[PDB]
């Protein structure tokens, strides 16, 4: 059975969506855009 191990407190796609959703329609930043985007303070 897929029993992947991990130490860092991980969250489920729901635990995130519920606590903070994107409002449908996947976000723009994902891979490299996430770094280019994350660096858009104000």
């Amino acid at each position: 059975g897929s029993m992947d191990e991990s130490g860092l407190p991980q969250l489920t796609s729901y635990d995130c969506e519920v606590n903070a959703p994107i409002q449908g329609s996947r976000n723009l930043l994902q891979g490299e855009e996430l770094l280019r985007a994350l660096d858009q303070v104000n």
Partner: protein, 101 residues
Amino acid sequence: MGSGAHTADPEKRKLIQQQLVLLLHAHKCQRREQANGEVRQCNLPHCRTMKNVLNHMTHCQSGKSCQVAHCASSRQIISHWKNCTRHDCPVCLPLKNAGDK
């Protein structure tokens, strides 16, 4: 459809902030070494780990259906933040209370 219960625990919002802060950290943390040339791995399991998870996501075009929890999950975290606009952001609010000037 899922269970159809619509759960919601604020006690976790704290964990969502740290992950959003560590990601924010790790984001600049990796940019802090470049300024100080070759630097040692800062004493922060969170950052270092995110640096690893970050490298993953950069090649995780799948997202959500990937093979890593911190990948897909982290993708939704940062994604929400930026995509978040004109709403009741419970995470972005406490992290950067900015909306009612």
